Amino acid sequence: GATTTATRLTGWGRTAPSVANVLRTPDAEMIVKAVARVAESGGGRGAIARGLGRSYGDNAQNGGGLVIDMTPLNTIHSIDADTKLVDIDAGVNLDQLMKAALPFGLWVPVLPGTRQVTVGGAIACDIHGKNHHSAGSFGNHVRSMDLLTADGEIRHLTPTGEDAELFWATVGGNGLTGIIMRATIEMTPTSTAYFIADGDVTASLDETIALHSDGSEARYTYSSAWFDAISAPPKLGRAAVSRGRLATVEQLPAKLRSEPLKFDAPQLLTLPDVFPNGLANKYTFGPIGELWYRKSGTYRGKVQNLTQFYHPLDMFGEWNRAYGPAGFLQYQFVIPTEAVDEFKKIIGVIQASGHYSFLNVFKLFGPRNQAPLSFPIPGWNICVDFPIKDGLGKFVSELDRRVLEFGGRLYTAKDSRTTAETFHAMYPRVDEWISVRRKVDPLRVFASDMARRLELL
Numbered sequence: 001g002a003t004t005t006a007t008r009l010t011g012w013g014r015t016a017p018s019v020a021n022v023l024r025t026p027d028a029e030m031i032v033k034a035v036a037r038v039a040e041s042g043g044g045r046g047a048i049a050r051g052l053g054r055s056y057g058d059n060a061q062n063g064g065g066l067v068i069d070m071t072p073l074n075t076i077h078s079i080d081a082d083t084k085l086v087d088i089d090a091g092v093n094l095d096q097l098m099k100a101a102l103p104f105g106l107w108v109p110v111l112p113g114t115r116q117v118t119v120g121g122a123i124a125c126d127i128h129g130k131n132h133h134s135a136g137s138f139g140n141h142v143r144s145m146d147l148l149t150a151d152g153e154i155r156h157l158t159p160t161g162e163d164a165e166l167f168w169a170t171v172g173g174n175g176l177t178g179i180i181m182r183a184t185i186e187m188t189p190t191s192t193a194y195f196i197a198d199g200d201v202t203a204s205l206d207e208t209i210a211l212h213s214d215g216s217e218a219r220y221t222y223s224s225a226w227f228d229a230i231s232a233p234p235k236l237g238r239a240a241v242s243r244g245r246l247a248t249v250e251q252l253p254a255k256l257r258s259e260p261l262k263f264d265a266p267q268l269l270t271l272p273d274v275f276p277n278g279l280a281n282k283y284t285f286g287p288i289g290e291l292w293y294r295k296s297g298t299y300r301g302k303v304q305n306l307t308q309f310y311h312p313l314d315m316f317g318e319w320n321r322a323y324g325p326a327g328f329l330q331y332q333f334v335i336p337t338e339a340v341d342e343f344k345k346i347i348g349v350i351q352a353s354g355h356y357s358f359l360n361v362f363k364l365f366g367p368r369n370q371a372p373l374s375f376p377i378p379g380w381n382i383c384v385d386f387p388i389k390d391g392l393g394k395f396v397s398e399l400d401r402r403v404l405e406f407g408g409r410l411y412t413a414k415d416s417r418t419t420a421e422t423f424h425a426m427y428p429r430v431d432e433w434i435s436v437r438r439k440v441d442p443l444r445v446f447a448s449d450m451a452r453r454l455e456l457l
């Protein structure tokens with residue numbers, strides 16, 4: 001049942017609200033009609049797809065225009081264990097897909113830190129995960145997709161076909177080449193739903209960097225770390241590192257061998273439920289605390305399910321991103337591998353800034369792909385979460401400048417406030433991408449708040 005409703009929209013960050021007509025229909029034919037209507041007009045304030053709204057900024061909103069909610073197009077058409085291909089509507093989310101694919105011994109090839117994202121959102125942001133250095137980003141695994149363009153046609157795009165240019169502009173394109181209706185993804189084969197993991201705890205930034213540079217990364221398909229962004233040096237940049245690979249059946253204890261592909265139910269009680277007063281005791285911040293933390297986060301060959309290995313912060317319940325009525329600003333950047341001193345300088349700047357981030361992701365990215373607006377490049381990728389308070393806006397503008405100067409970039413899926421000038425300098429293939437977009441949407445049928453702010457329109 002199709003509905004068109006005026007709706008106040010924000011990204012996950014709950015900032016920059018704007019009002020748009022939100023179309024919500026399970027009918028593909030209706031979506032086509034709306035795009036044909038906008039194009040007949042043709043353009044006006046245009047249209048943009050929206051997935052599950054997990055992007056923090058303004059890429060899935062369109063103030064004074066049309067937003068098409070893609071979540072009702074969520075049919076899994078087929079899964080094939082022999083070809084390893086899945087054929088699914090763009091509104092299918094990655095949790096749904098993971099659960100449907102497991103009985104075939106198939107693994108979603110790129111998983112982000114939350115499972116509530118659409119296939120369309122995964123493609124449009126060319127999302128990355130803990131296995132980026134071994135598997136690339138989501139775009140690398142798309143074998144085809146059906147794109148509804150401004151001319152009202154549906155184009156079958158393939159990575160190396162005749163429409164490869166448009167394919168690779170849609171990857172990481174933030175919905176600005178049209179509406180992805182449907183895609184075919186090549187999955188990763190697996191015999192189990194478990195990981196075998198090694199954990200390490202480092203004492204400092206220099207140590208965290210050495211561990212990622214000593215060659216050991218090549219022995220793990222999956223690798224990420226939490227780091228300390230608050231402590232003065234030398235504690236600054238100390239990390240709990242979690243690295244592993246998917247387990248094989250024989251690597252499971254006998255207990256788990258009868259259902260190797262099973263996903264366990266996320267249990268009832270989290271840590272806030274069990275320890276409401278917190279985890280701190282008289283030992284926590286001294287030498288016995290340091291030792292305990294070091295020992296508990298150091299291990300070899302530990303069998304873990306998805307939550308344990310991949311969503312380790314789920315146990316922290318209501319404690320993560322808590323207490324702030326003002327909200328938080330999520331800031332994610334990557335710095336080229338070779339710029340290691342520069343990378344260390346930026347971590348120092350953050351620590352000395354007087355803005356405190358507790359939730360810190362650290363990962364070494366691998367080789368980039370051919371998508372001109374793709375975020376990942378090989379090098380040091382960082383996510384930080386700053387509580388909103390005075391001076392933050394002007395400080396993150398300074399961070400932008402250092403990120404840019406050091407050859408790095410910000411991620412559109414996280415950004416709500418960088419400038420067009422900074423963004424364009426961070427993405428030297430932006431003009432190349434813009435030319436593809438104007439060729440495929442001369443009338444700006446597709447438009448968003450981000451497109452206008454970053455002058456991608």
Ligand SMILES: Cc1cc2nc3c(=O)[nH]c(=O)nc-3n(C[C@H](O)[C@H](O)[C@H](O)COP(=O)(O)OP(=O)(O)OC[C@H]3O[C@@H](n4cnc5c(N)ncnc54)[C@H](O)[C@@H]3O)c2cc1C
Nearest residue numbers: 051052053054055112113118120121124127128174175180
């Ligand atoms: C807790 C959390 C953890 C995260 N962890 C990671 C991570 O590890 N790695 C990572 O890369 N990202 C991560 N993200 C970011 C997230 O994966 C991206 O923002 C993703 O794009 C969200 O998907 P969505 O379906 O919610 O899309 P939305 O936010 O609704 O839309 C995002 C973009 O995709 C476009 N789009 C959506 N559907 C379509 C379609 N059918 N056709 C064309 N364009 C479309 C939109 O127009 C918009 O430009 C995380 C986000 C959160 C909240």
Ligand SMILES: O=C(O)c1nc2ccc(C(F)(F)F)cc2nc1NCc1ccc(F)cc1
Nearest residue numbers: 113128129130224313314320361362363383
């Ligand atoms: O919050 C994010 O936006 C995010 N971004 C990531 C980007 C890259 C990666 C990486 F591991 F791939 F690098 C992990 C991320 N995890 C992320 N978060 C995981 C998370 C965030 C909040 C929680 F409460 C529990 C888990």
